[PDB]
Amino acid sequence: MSPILGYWKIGLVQPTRLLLEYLEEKYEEHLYERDEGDKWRNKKFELGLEFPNLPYYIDGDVKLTQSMAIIRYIADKHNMLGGCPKERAEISMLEGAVLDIRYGVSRIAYSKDFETLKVDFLSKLPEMLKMFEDRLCHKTYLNGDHVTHPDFMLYDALDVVLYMDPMCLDAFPKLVCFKKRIEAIPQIDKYLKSSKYIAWPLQGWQATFGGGDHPPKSDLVPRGSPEFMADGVRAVVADDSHFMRVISDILSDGGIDVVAQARDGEEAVSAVIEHRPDVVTMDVEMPVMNGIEATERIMAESPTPVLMLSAHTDENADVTFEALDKGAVDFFTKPGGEVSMEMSRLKDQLVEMVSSVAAVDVGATGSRSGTGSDSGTAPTTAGGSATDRRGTGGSSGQTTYVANPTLVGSSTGGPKMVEQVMENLPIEADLRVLIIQHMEGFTGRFAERINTRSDYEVQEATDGARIGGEGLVAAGRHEVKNYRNGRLRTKLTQDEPVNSVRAVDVTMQTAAETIDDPLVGLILTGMGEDGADGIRRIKQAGGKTIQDEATSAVYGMPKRAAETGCVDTVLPIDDIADGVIDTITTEVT
Secondary structure, X not given: OOXXXXXXXXXXXXXXXXXHHHOHHHHOHHHHOOOOOOOOOOOOOOOOOOEOOOOEOOOOOOHHHHHOOXXXXXXXXXXXXXXXXXXXXXXXXXXHHHHHHHOOOOOOOOOOHHHHHXXXXXXXXXXXXXXXXXXXXXXXXXXXXXOOOOOOOOHHHHHHXXXXXXXXXXXXXXXXXXXXXXXXXXXXXXXXXXXXXXXXXXXXXXXXXXXXXXXXXXXXXXXXXXXXXXXXXXXXXXXXXXXOOOOOOOOOOOOEOOOXXXXXXXXXXXXXXXXXXXXXXXOOOOOOOOOOOOOHHHHOOOOOOEEEEOOOOOOHHHHHHHHXXXXXXXXXXXXXXXXXXXXXXXXXXXXXXXXXXXOOOOOOHHHOOOOOOOOOOOOOOHHXXXXXXXXXXXXXXOOOOOOOOOOOOOOOOHHHXXXXXXXXXXXXXOOOOOOOOOOOOOOOXXXXXXXXXXXXXXXXXXXXXXXXXXXXXXOOOOOOOOOOOOOOOOOOOOOOOHHHOOOHHHHHHHHHHOOOOOOOEOOOOOOOOHHHHOOOOOOOOOOOEOOOOOOOXXXXXXXXXXXXOXXXXXXXXXXXXXXXXXXXXXXXX
C-alpha cells in the first residue's frame, strides 16, 4: 500500500482544527477586556472555519477557506517545524496574515459591493428622472390644457435626490446586498448539505494546491470523520517523567496515537515492538540503560525510525548526533517550560514530523539490513582522487586544472544519508561543500565528525572562515561573496527567510551569478522545494545539479527531483565522492 502516505497525513487533524481554540480562547477575550457597560455590543465575531462534519463556515468567502488549503500541502510535505526553532517565524504570525487578510481584505469587497450596488441604484436613478420628466408632459396633451406644468413639479426630486444621505445613498444600496443575501445563503448552504460530495474534492485536496506557511485554521473537517480508515499512525511515549509525554495528550485528538508509555529505556524496547506503531518518540537519559543505546538495543532487532527528542545542553549535540549513526532520521528539537499558548504549535513540530518520519514503508530499514552487512568506513575515490592517490604527482599524468572548489544541502536525511557523502572529501582536492540543514551548537558537533573521522578537516562557520582546504558547512542567520581578487569566502545571511525557511535556497541561488562553471550544486535528503527553484538556474545554464530512493527514507526534497529535468539523472547514496570529484575533472581543466 502506497496511498497510505496520504493516509499517513489527513495526524494532520491537529494542524487543522487547532485555532478554533484560538477563537473561543481569543474572542472570549474581546469580552471581559470590556466592562459592565460594554455588555451588549460584542459577539458577532464569526467563528470562521470550514465544517463538512457540522454546520459552520466563513461568512461568504469559501475562497479564503480554500486559499488556506492552497497552503498546508507544502507546509507539511516540506516540514517547516521539525527542524529549527527559527524556521517557524513568518508562520505563526502569518496565520494572522490570511486571518487578517480576510480580516483586512474582506471590506475591499464589502465597501466595494455597496459601491457596485450604489452605481446601479444611481445608474437607473438617471432613468427615474428620465422616467419622471417624460411622465409629467402627456396629460398636458390629454387634459384640456390643465397646466400645473412638469418642470416646477420636477426640482422637488433633484432637491431630494441629493438631500439623500448614506442611509439612502450608501446604506439603501447596503440594505439590499445582504437583503439579497437572504436570497443567497440558501444555495451557499445547499452545496454541502444536500450533497456529501464536498469532501470528495476536499479529501482529494490533500494532494494538490501550493502556498507555504501555517494558516490552516480548520479546513480538513472537524475532529471526527470516519474516513480515517484502516490503520492510523501510532507513536510510543518515552520521556523522563510523567507530565513530559498535555505532552501525552499531544496525539490524542484524532490522528497520531500513543500505544506505549514508559519512563524506562528498557520498558520501552519491551513496548514499542509490542503493538507496533511506526515511531518511538524518545529522549536522552533513561533509567537503567540510556536513550543513546535504547535505540540500537532496539535497532539490532527492529530498526524503527526513532524520533530523538533532545533538549540539547550543547553536549546533547552527540546524543542527538551519535544516535543518528545508531538509527535516527529526523530529531525533535525538544523544549520544556512555560505552558501557555504554543503547545498548539509545539505539537505540529512533533506530529507533522511523524507525518514525515513515519512516512516510511520498510525501505530505509531494508536498505543495508536485509542480511548481516555493516557498511563500515570509506572506500577510495576511484574515479577521481584515488587515481591521484595512486600515481605520479609529477608532470607526467598532471592536469591543466584549476583550484576552484565546487560548492554543495539537506535536512531530514542529513544525519546519515548526507554524512556518508562528506566522509570522502580528500585533502589533496581543494573543495567546499554546502550543508545548510535542520539543526544551536549542532553546527559544532555535526561537522566535528567529518573533521576527525574523514581524513580532511571541516569546520564550523564563523565570521568568515574563507575557503579550498576545508569546508563551508554550518547553517549558522547564515552570503559568500567575491572581493576583487578571484575566489570566495564564507559570509552570512539573516533577513526575513528566503522561501519562509531559516534558507537553503539563497546560498544556491547566489552562486549562479558569483563563481560559475567550476561550481556544482547538489540535492540530497530534506523535504523543502528550495533546491528546486534555486539551482534551477545553475542547470538552466551551466552548473551540475545532483537523490534516488533505495538509500534514504522519506522523499519530499527529492519528491520533485524529476518534474523539472534540470537534474542530470538519478543518484542514490554510497560512494558519492567518486563522482562528485569527477565533476571537478573536465570543467576545471
